[PDB]
Structures are given as structure tokens and as C-alpha cells.
């Protein structure tokens, strides 16, 4: 959708003789709190044997970019369960906010691995601070000095059906 | 990473050695028990004494 980054906490059901449990926490990317919390239960289940029937969710909050203007070079880990045995993957996204970078990442995954939301697991989204930590080409292309490139054969878009000009591409 | 994975493979070989020695010794118990369970301890001490040179 238009993603958001929640942070979820969980304190698998307390008991006497084993009270005040360990209070785990995750960062989730989702559209609505409902889906955030579902993903959180599922990630618990996969990490170790917990359940929903035997655990509870403490406080699901939502985070925001402290600087959603400064353009940052995110480097993302991903991994996923499809469609053969799993594997890891490392991609890079020059973008403005982590939730945007993950939007484009889900897009690219669905375009290339054909793989849907079930499998893709975000592991770590890190804002690179230095140049020369970026190594990928298609991101280093824009990290060069004094960039100046023209638009790609900018074709017009029409509102009416019959024109009288033989349009000219710009220029 | 390579040194740490060396140390953890050495952990795996450690569990290997402990299980192999415990299993083989408990299996030697298994064997002498499953032999002597029916027939006489005289015949089992005498087989002890007929193999005693190995």
C-alpha cells in the first residue's frame, strides 16, 4: 500500500513462578496495524516456539523518519522462502525514507522473483553515511560530481483526441 | 567469520566425540548384557578368557 514502519512489543503470557517475561520487540513494515501485528506473531512463531494463544502484544507504535527530506542511500538485506530452498539477498535503494525504500523493494521483488508478500522478509535497512561504502553501480551513477542528464525523449500526454500540430518532443 | 565457524565446527566435532564414546560404551554394555542375559556367567567369563589375548 503506502507503507508504514511500526514497532511492536510482546510479553508472552505471564505466569506465577515465571512472571514479568522477556519483552521482545520488532520493527515491521505494513499498511495497517492489523497486518503489522499479524506479521509480528508470525515472525515470533518462526523464530522460536511461541503462539498467540500463549502470548500477548504490549504496545504497537509507529515510527517516522527523523529527516524525511535528506536523501539517503539505504542498503537493505532481504531473504525469502520461495520457491525453491531459501536464500539471502542484498540490494540498495537511494531514496528519501525507509518506508519508501521498502515500497520499491517489494515492487522489485514482485517484478523479478515473481515472489509475493508471503516470503519476503526484511532483515536490516541501514542508512549509509559515507560514500565509498556504496559499491553498486546503478546507485553510484548518481553519486558522481555535477550531475546533468536530459529527460528521456519526453513524450507528450494528450487530453483531447484530435490535434492540429504534429507535436514536437521536448526540447 | 572463518575462524568463528572453525570454532563452532569444533563444537560440532566435540558433541560428535562425546556421543560416539558414550554410545559405543553403552552398546558394549548392550552386547555383553544381551549375550549373558540367558546363558551362564561361567561361559561368559570363559569367553572373556578365550578373547583375553586381544
Amino acid at each position: 500500500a503506502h507503507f508504514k514502519e511500526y514497532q511492536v512489543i510482546g510479553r508472552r503470557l505471564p505466569t506465577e513462578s515465571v512472571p514479568e517475561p522477556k519483552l521482545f520487540r520488532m520493527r515491521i513494515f505494513a499498511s495497517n496495524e492489523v497486518i503489522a501485528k499479524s506479521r509480528y506473531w508470525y515472525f515470533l512463531q518462526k523464530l522460536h516456539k511461541v503462539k498467540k494463544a500463549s502470548g500477548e502484544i504490549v504496545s504497537i507504535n509507529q515510527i517516522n523518519e527523523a529527516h524525511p527530506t535528506k536523501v539517503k542511500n539505504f542498503g537493505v538485506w532481504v531473504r525469502y522462502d520461495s520457491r525453491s530452498g531459501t536464500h539471502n539477498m542484498y540490494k540498495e535503494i537511494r531514496d528519501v525514507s525507509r518506508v519508501a525504500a521498502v515500497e520499491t523493494l517489494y515492487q522489485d521483488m514482485a517484478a523479478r522473483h515473481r515472489a509475493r508478500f508471503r516470503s519476503i522478509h526484511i532483515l536490516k535497512v541501514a542508512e549509509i553515511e559515507k560514500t565509498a561504502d556504496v559499491k553498486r553501480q546503478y546507485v553510484k551513477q548518481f553519486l558522481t560530481k555535477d550531475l546533468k542528464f536530459p529527460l528521456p525523449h519526453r513524450v507528450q500526454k494528450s487530453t483531447k483526441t484530435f490535434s492540429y500540430k504534429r507535436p514536437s518532443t521536448f526540447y | 567469520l572463518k575462524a568463528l565457524k572453525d570454532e563452532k565446527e569444533e563444537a560440532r566435532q566435540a558433541k560428535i566425540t562425546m556421543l560416539k564414546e558414550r554410545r559405543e560404551k553403552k552398546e558394549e554394555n548392550e552386547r555383553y548384557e544381551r549375550l549373558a542375559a540367558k546363558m551362564h556367567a561361567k561361559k561368559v567369563e570363559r569367553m572373556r578368557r578365550r578373547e583375553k589375548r586381544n
Binding site: 542498503g75 538485506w77 542484498y90 541501514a126 561504502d133 559499491k135 | -
Partner: peptide, 25 residues
């Protein structure tokens, strides 16, 4: 190919020197 090829196992070992030690005492 990750850039932070240093901090990762360091953090895992920071965890492990506690996950091991919080058994005995």
C-alpha cells in the same frame, strides 16, 4: 557485499557473552 561487515558479528558476540553467562549464575 554488505557495508557494515564489522558491526554484525561484533553485536552477535556482545549478545553471546551474555546468553552463555546467564546460565550459571
Amino acid at each position: 557485499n554488505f557495508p557494515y561487515k564489522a558491526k554484525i558479528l561484533e553485536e552477535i558476540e556482545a549478545k553471546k557473552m551474555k546468553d552463555l553467562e546467564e546460565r550459571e549464575l
